[PDB]
Design a protein around this ligand. Structure first.
Ligand SMILES: [Zn+2]
Ligand SMILES: [Zn+2]
Lengths: 150, 49, 110, 146, 67, 164, 228, 765, 42
């Protein structure tokens, strides 16, 4: 056995069809925080949503932040699920924007981020294709008897 | 013999011939040395080239 | 629309079988042939039923346990001209009888 | 969308019990086929026009797709405004069944939403009949590549 | 497995309150959201792990050596 | 809501019934134009009844064909296999009542030619057996009977009368 | 227009799907001479000309007797009266039938008497009744169909499916100095070489500007070159 | 608390799945096998007898697995999980009972092992079967592993549900050139055999059957088929008027130019062109030379004794090709599921069995000859323990098949491979992911795009959300959540019943049919063409939904093509849903309180006449609505829930109706690669390469599909609090950016487990 | 001409006739034909 720390270069998914690999691993201090003090854990590139045109996830985020406040697993399902328009009501009284967006402070500078940002809980499952398996190198190795080429 | 009906008795003309065989996939397609294979990841800070 | 015309052809039959039926009231040699479900579903074999066309051209046909068993129309024979025969005591057979005119089935309703 | 339902509805309802003007499509019944395909395309694009134009300033399916890089105005039109005419093999979805597409439709329905059409945005959700359709077009593309 | 000993963002220690959480739910039947709140987690990423995190370790202790 | 009576029949030497491909209903006033002469046969198990009707010389007959090889001035050759299946019943309407009768074996009737058997007469000279062939060869072996033919109404009224 | 078209142009085989012939018309009309030449070459009209077919026997008489609608020749303008199509029958008959007398009494009649493994009168009779309402009457036998088209707004001129490019080039009432097509190989058999090449890099560049990108003419001219 | 008629139907799907399980396909077919088809196979061959010593016989009587008549379940067997560590093969022994001929006054019997059968986890005969959470402990094994996978040689494998083209059915294909091949390939028991038919040339059309030499004019055969009237052929296969008149008669010509009269010689044209009987048996060169073939050529579908059935069957087939020659379209593609019948492990392992058992008998004969060749004393000798020494070919041979995937069937001379797999455990989802996977096979070459795309008929009876890229030589699909693969039912009763309703036997029929009504096809075989088709239908369907012949035996009318079909075939896809009588459903909303109480459950609505199983054919004839909210009293049925359409894998995705489908396809191609908690027995089992995660968590938003696969008790993933922003500049396409001091706090940590087996073995020295 | 055999019920065909005239028989079962044939089809 060995316990792999999720090293740079490890495929993650959004369970929603986003299939990606981590980039720089930033420290803690960096990346936004806002008012509670929380630090977004995974931080994700926006561009993927429009060209892949998948808004399901981008609702799942709302449903998530709404869930963890009421303290209830909140449902969703094909042709059905929790009706979005009430999700707002659950947040707006508890202080978070009627849509998922919220302010954040860039960790680097420390001044307000000039545009709103949108975040909540999302379920990111980690995949096979751990890199420490898949990296490969050779100097001069064995050759097959027949062709005597690597 | 055997006689459990073993089809690919052909040993020769084909090893020289087709698909990924000798002549193409092996001699013109030679598998190489001093190499490496890895997953990628962006690096803006690094220059081009 | 399908059923309307379909179910109408029922009463169209009650007319059809009705006329040529009562035209058999005489005693020539003319035979109409039926089909009945097997197992003889009436009541028992103690040792039968009868027919009616109820008002507005129905069919009430009963056998046993006053079972309501009704079927009408038929498959259309036409080109086949059908003749009823008899086996007379093995050899010296073949007494021909009544030919055929009418044909109708019967089915337990549901 | 409703402006098209009665327009093409008028075309199909007068084709069955009467005749019409058949464009140079050689035989007929493809007349209303090219009609419905053109009309629904122009409607779908037109709703995207008021989707991109009257959309607010400073929002990402605009600043990105309207201008720079990922996606395009048709793409964001499929998100907010409407999706339309899942089109496989060049036209609407052919009959797998008899005189119908799916079990959920009556017989001899030439209306849209009966073949590979959707009136709902990805945002408003989908109905099963249009979902199964939208599970086709993108797939015929996938095999068409593979 | 076991409730983590801090969340994955804040760093407030959640290791403790999982016991007091579940106890506070079973005895003194009380709804989730209200429960965790007076249990002292206002920030939600601190909170998820209490709320989330099925506890497997029980279902893994059926299989122990002695039985 | 009235009643029209019906009652069963007995065995009464069975029954049977032909239908044949030859002669449909006439288009004219009386569509019937009944067959003739009978002169038939039977054999057990497989029945295969030879059925016979003579031919007219005025019919555009061509005695030459009959005088060519096979002699056709003889009767017309009809036969076919047959089957019984239950529930199939004849009936007749006697006055206000009606009498059903069982049928049993029903045969189609197919015209064919012993004439090509004559085509064989000049053609021939100068374990296992499980299936329909097991039935064909047996059908050939045991094939043999001369059946008379009769017509009339005797018990078909009265047997039905006495058995109600 | 797909990439498999490049497959066939590069591959340069004998037979090809949708082998269009582009042929510019003499002048610009949608009427008459417009349609006329289309009537001068389109497949065979015989069944469309066939009206109904007729067979009768009088004693020994064996008749294949049919009639025709002249008003159709008035619809689509063609050059025939009867004896044109009359001799045309025995012309094309070489596929099956044999040459003999044929006649009209008036207004579109044919007369075919046939005669002598017996019942030959009946057997040939059948095949005659069968394939006759097919065979070529007027047209160019390798051409399936033709369409008159509209160019821009002003010009309107036909394109024709078929392999000929020689006959239809020759065919009266179409200026031949400009006629254009696909399937390079058959260009190579009429104009040939330098023409075939200069076509292949026109058509490659054509089809591959529809699917997008741009390859420049530089490379294409080279492809069509080493192919030629 | 009145339950809302809108969603209350939700409570169905669990109760459906609760008793009758999620993965029941592989179970039932198995449990049907061991409990039944063994008692068939031996009932086929119960007597082996040599040629020698005219007094001998060996008479099988009963077959049993694990039950020697001591207790109900076998008194002792080896526990499966522990059997997985030793590289053993989970097995229950076979038991057979025999009759001998040995010496004067014997004819004795016993209870004997012929060998061992690798039964299937959580079958009937398994130790795990019906054991709750306690035996689970003591047997050291997972509660939530759905089972239905075998285990052999210590590895862990599955028979994969194998799709197969419809067998014993009509099909009509057209093409450029060609001339519209028709085909009917029929098989049962002996001799799986194809029969093609087509035009050769120009209205002149012929039977190609490789048993015959080359071809026959169909007019000849149909004559020899025992309809001799000739020109009534035209009236039969053609029609009355339409166009069809001419097109067929052209064919009918060339029969006249040759020969006629099946009474002797018209048959003789056939046997004249048949190949030889291979020496002996040729004795049947006759006019009955080919009378064998005319009932058994290909078709074992009819055969029998007189000809009229097969005759008119081949006729009605010949109709559909000339219908195609009239116009293209109006024909049958092979795409929509109703023309394809998948098949489970049940019939597979038998077919393999009766072969291995058959070779067991053929050779056990030849071993009982050696003893009885050379007389010694009066040769008696038990002639019974020799089954032990001459066995395994039944067992070890069977293990070879089930593990490797080479099935060599000598009896069909038909070989298939790649038919099983290592069940891949990377996740609890993959556990039932390999399970319930449809492997299509054959597919000729790849170049046809036809047997590829996703046909709209597939709605709800197969997962729409995955068709991954492991295609290659085949195709892979998945079932829906609610499917019940119909088994074999029966025939003769439904036949005589059909008559009871008043259909008329073909023998009585006019010999003018096509005009009158439609015709009633059992399994694609003509019977009655009854009067009043629709009333017949509603009557029959009314019977099925309550009284008799339930589940399958579907029925559907047809219009364009004139037919009504009663299909009894097994190995076929069916699905649940509710009948709406008049406007509303049959539920009546008080029935569900009467349900969730637990005194009612499922498979009770059939006997109450609420829900039944349709079929792709039937439902195509039927009319369905989505929501109870929208009904019109033109309707028949309403789906119980719309989200049954997404597969067990697909049900994961939250809010799938907001995506574009290729994303869900890639997702059903991913989630089975999500590392996870596997099963509760995780740490105790020892596997080849097994990942697993340190701190799994319930996905924050579930789906009513997840909770019913127990996916939240084995969650695979972390639940990560995640901005959406451009940061760094290390981001770009799909590339995430993680968080130190978070990843270090126990986010997304993995383990990995490998096994190294080293077998120690003694050498002949 | 493709017509029906009365009686014999097989087929019809035009045949080569004696003294010409072709008559019209039913091959392989006795029949003959009046000629003077009125034959009309479209
Ligand atoms: Zn926190
Ligand atoms: Zn005749």
């Amino acid at each position: 056995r060995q316990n792999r720390r999720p090293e740079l270069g490890d495929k993650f998914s959004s369970r929603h069809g986003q299939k990606g690999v981590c980039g720089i691993i930033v420290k803690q201090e960096d990346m936004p925080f806002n008012d509670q003090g929380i630090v977004p854990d995974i931080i994700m590139n926006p561009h993927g949503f429009p060209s892949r045109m998948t808004v399901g996830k981008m609702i799942e985020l709302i449903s998530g932040k709404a869930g963890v406040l009421n303290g209830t697993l909140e449902y969703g399902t094909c042709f059905g699920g929790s009706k979005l328009e009430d999700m707002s009501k659950i947040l707006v009284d508890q202080g978070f924007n009627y849509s998922g967006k919220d302010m954040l402070y860039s960790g680097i500078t420390g001044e307000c981020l000039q545009a709103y940002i949108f975040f909540g809980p999302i379920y990111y499952q980690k995949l096979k294709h751990m890199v420490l398996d898949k990296m490969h190198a050779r100097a001069r190795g064995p050759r097959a008897v027949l062709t005597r080429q690597p | 013999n055997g006689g459990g009906k073993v089809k690919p008795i052909r040993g020769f003309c084909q090893r020289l011939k087709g698909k990924q065989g000798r002549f193409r996939g092996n001699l013109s397609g030679k598998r190489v040395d001093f190499s490496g294979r890895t997953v990628i990841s962006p690096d803006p800070n690094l220059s081009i080239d | 629309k399908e059923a309307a015309a379909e179910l109408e052809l029922l009463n169209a039959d009650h007319q059809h079988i009705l006329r040529k039926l009562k035209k058999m009231n005489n005693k020539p040699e003319r035979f109409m042939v039926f089909q009945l479900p097997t197992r003889l579903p009436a009541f028992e074999r103690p040792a039968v039923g009868s027919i009616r066309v109820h008002k507005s051209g129905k069919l009430s046909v009963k056998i046993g346990n006053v079972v309501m068993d009704i079927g009408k129309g038929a498959e259309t024979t036409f080109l086949q001209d059908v003749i009823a025969l008899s086996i007379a005591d093995d050899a010296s057979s073949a007494e021909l009888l009544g030919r055929v005119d009418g044909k109708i089935v019967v089915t337990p309703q549901i | 969308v409703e402006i098209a339902y009665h327009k093409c509805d008028e075309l199909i309802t007068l084709f069955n019990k009467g005749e019409l003007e058949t464009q140079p499509g050689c035989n007929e019944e493809q007349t209303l086929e090219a009609k419905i395909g053109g009309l629904l395309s122009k409607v779908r694009e037109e709703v995207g026009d008021v989707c991109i134009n009257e959309l607010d300033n400073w929002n990402a399916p605009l600043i990105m797709a309207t201008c720079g890089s990922k996606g395009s105005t048709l793409n964001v039109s499929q998100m907010v405004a409407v999706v339309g005419q899942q089109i496989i093999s060049g036209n609407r979805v052919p009959d797998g069944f008899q005189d119908r597409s799916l079990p959920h439709f009556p017989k001899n329905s030439k209306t849209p939403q009966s073949k590979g059409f959707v009136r709902n945005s990805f945002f408003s959700g989908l109905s099963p009949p249009e979902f199964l359709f939208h599970a086709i077009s993108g797939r015929e593309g996938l095999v068409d590549t593979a | 497995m076991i409730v983590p000993v801090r969340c994955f963002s804040c760093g407030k220690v959640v290791g403790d309150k999982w016991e007091s959480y579940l106890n506070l739910l079973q005895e003194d039947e009380l709804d989730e959201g209200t429960a965790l709140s007076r249990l002292g987690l206002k920030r939600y990423c601190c909170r998820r792990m209490i709320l989330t995190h099925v506890d497997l370790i029980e279902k893994f202790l059926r299989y122990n050596p002695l039985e | 809501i009235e009643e029209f009576p019906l009652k069963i029949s007995g065995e009464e030497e069975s029954l049977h019934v032909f239908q044949y491909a030859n002669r449909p209903r006439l288009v004219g006033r009386k569509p019937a134009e009944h067959p003739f002469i009978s002169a038939a046969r039977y054999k057990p198990k497989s029945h295969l009844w030879e059925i016979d009707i003579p031919l007219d010389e005025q019919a555009f007959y061509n005695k030459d064909k009959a005088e060519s090889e096979w002699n056709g001035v003889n009767v017309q050759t009809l036969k076919g296999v047959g089957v019984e299946n239950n529930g199939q019943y004849a009936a007749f309407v006697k006055d206000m009542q009606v009498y059903l009768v069982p049928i049993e074996r029903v045969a189609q009737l197919k015209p064919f030619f012993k004439y090509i058997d004559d085509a064989n007469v000049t053609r021939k000279q100068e374990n296992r057996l499980t299936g329909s062939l097991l039935a064909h060869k047996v059908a050939d072996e045991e094939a043999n009977i001369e059946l008379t033919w009769a017509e009339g109404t005797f018990e078909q009224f009265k047997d039905t009368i006495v058995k109600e | 227009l797909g990439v498999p078209r490049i497959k066939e142009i590069i591959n340069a085989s004998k037979v090809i799907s949708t082998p269009i012939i582009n042929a510019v018309l003499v002048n610009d009309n949608d009427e008459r001479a417009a349609r006329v030449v289309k009537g001068r070459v389109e497949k065979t009209l015989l069944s469309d000309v066939a009206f109904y077919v007729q067979d009768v026997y009088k004693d020994n008489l064996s008749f294949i007797q049919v009639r025709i609608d002249l008003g159709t020749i008035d619809k689509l303008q063609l050059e025939l009266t009867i004896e044109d199509i009359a001799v045309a029958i025995t012309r094309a008959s070489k596929l099956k039938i044999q040459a003999s007398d044929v006649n009209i009494i008036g207004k579109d009649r044919i007369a075919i008497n046939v005669f002598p493994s017996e019942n030959d009168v009946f057997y040939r009779m059948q095949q005659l009744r069968r394939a006759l309402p097919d065979v070529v009457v007027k047209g160019l036998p390798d051409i399936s169909r033709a369409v008159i088209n509209i160019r821009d707004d002003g010009k309107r001129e036909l394109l024709v499916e078929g392999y000929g490019l020689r006959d239809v080039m020759c065919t009266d009432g179409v200026i031949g100095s400009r006629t254009t097509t696909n399937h390079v190989l058959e260009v190579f058999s009429v104009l040939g070489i330098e023409a075939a090449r200069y076509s292949i890099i026109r058509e490659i560049n054509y089809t591959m500007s529809n699917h997008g990108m741009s390859v420049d003419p530089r490379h294409i001219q080279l492809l069509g070159d080493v192919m030629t | 608390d009145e339950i809302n008629t809108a969603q209350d139907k939700w409570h169905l799907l669990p109760a459906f799945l609760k008793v009758k399980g999620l993965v029941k396909q592989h179970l039932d077919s198995f449990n049907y096998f061991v409990d039944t088809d063994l008692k068939k196979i031996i009932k086929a061959n119960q007597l082996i007898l040599s040629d020698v010593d005219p007094e001998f016989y060996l008479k099988y009587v009963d077959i049993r697995v694990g039950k020697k008549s001591s207790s109900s379940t076998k008194d002792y067997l080896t526990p499966p999980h522990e059997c997985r560590l030793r590289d053993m093969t989970y097995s229950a022994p076979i038991y057979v009972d025999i009759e001998y001929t040995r010496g004067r006054n014997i004819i004795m019997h016993k209870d004997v092992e012929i060998g061992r059968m690798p039964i299937m986890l959580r079958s009937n005969k398994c130790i795990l079967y019906d054991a709750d959470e306690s035996k689970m402990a003591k047997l050291n094994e997972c509660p939530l592993d759905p089972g239905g996978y075998f285990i052999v040689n210590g590895t862990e494998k599955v028979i994969l549900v194998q799709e197969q083209l419809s067998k014993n059915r009509i099909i009509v294909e057209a093409d450029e050139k060609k001339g519209i091949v028709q085909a009917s390939v029929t098989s049962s028991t002996h001799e799986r055999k194809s029969k093609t038919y087509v035009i050769t040339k120009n209205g002149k059309i012929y039977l190609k059957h490789n048993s015959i030499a080359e071809e026959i004019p169909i007019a000849i055969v149909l004559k020899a088929c025992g309809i001799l009237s000739d020109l009534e052929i035209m009236q039969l296969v053609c029609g009355n008027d339409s166009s069809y008149q001419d097109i067929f008669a052209v064919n009918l010509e060339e029969s006249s130019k040759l020969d006629i009269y099946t009474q002797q010689q018209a048959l003789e044209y056939i046997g004249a062109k048949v190949k030889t009987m291979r020496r002996q048996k040729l004795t049947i060169l006759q006019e009955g030379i080919e009378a064998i073939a005319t009932t058994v050529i290909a078709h074992l579908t009819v055969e029998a004794l007189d000809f009229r059935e097969k005759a008119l069957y081949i006729a009605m087939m010949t109709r559909r090709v000339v219908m195609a020659m009239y116009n293209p379209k109006m024909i049958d593609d092979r795409d929509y599921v109703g023309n394809k019948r998948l098949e489970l492990a049940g019939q597979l392992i038998s077919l393999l069995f009766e072969d291995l058992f058959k070779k067991f008998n053929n050779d056990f004969k030849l071993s009982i000859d050696k003893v009885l060749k050379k007389p010694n004393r009066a040769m008696e000798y038990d002639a019974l323990l020799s089954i032990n020494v001459h066995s395994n070919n039944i067992t070890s041979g069977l293990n070879r098949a089930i593990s490797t995937g080479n099935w060599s069937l000598k009896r069909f001379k038909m070989e298939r491979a790649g038919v099983t797999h290592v069940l891949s455990r990377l996740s609890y989802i993959s556990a039932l992911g390999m399970m319930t996977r449809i492997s299509s096979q054959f597919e000729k070459s790849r170049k046809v795009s036809g047997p590829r795309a996703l046909q709209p008929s597939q709605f709800g009876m197969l997962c729409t959300a995955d068709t991954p890229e492991g295609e290659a030589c085949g195709l892979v699909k998945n079932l829906a959540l609610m499917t019940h693969i119909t088994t074999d039912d029966e025939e003769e009763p439904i036949k005589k019943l059909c008559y009871v309703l008043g259909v008329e036997d073909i023998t009585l029929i006019d010999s003018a049919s096509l005009h009158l009504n439609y015709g009633v096809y059992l399994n694609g075989t003509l019977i009655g063409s009854i009067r009043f088709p629709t009333k017949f239908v509603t009557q029959f369907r009314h019977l099925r939904r309550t009284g008799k012949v339930s589940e399958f035996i579907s029925i559907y009318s047809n219009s364009h093509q004139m037919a009504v079909h009663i299909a009894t075939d097994g190995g076929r896809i069916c699905r649940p849903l509710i009948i709406v009588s008049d406007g509303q459903s049959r539920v009546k909303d008080i029935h569900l309180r009467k349900l969730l109480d637990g005194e009612l459950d499922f498979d009770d609505f059939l006997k109450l006449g609420l829900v039944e199983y349709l079929d792709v054919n039937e439902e195509n004839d039927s009319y369905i609505a989505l929501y109870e909210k929208d009904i019109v009293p033109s309707m028949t049925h309403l789906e119980i829930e719309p989200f049954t359409i997404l597969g067990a894998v697909a049900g994961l995705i939250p809010y799938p109706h907001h995506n574009q489908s290729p994303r869900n396809t890639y997702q059903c191609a991913m989630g089975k690669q999500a590392i996870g908690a596997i099963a509760y027995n995780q740490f105790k089992r020892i596997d080849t390469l097994l990942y697993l995660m340190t701190y799994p968590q319930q996905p924050m938003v579930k789906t009513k599909t997840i909770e019913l696969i127990d996916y939240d008790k084995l969650p695979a993933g972390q639940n990560a609090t995640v901005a959406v922003m451009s940061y760094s500049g290390y981001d770009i396409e799909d590339a995430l950016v993680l968080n130190k001091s978070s990843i270090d706090r126990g986010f997304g940590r993995c383990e990995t487990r490998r096994k190294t087996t080293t077998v120690l073995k003694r050498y002949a020295n | 001409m493709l017509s029906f055999c009365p009686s014999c019920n097989n087929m019809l065909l035009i045949t080569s006739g004696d003294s010409g005239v072709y008559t019209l028989a039913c091959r392989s079962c006795p029949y003959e034909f009046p000629i003077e044939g009125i034959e009309i089809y479209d």
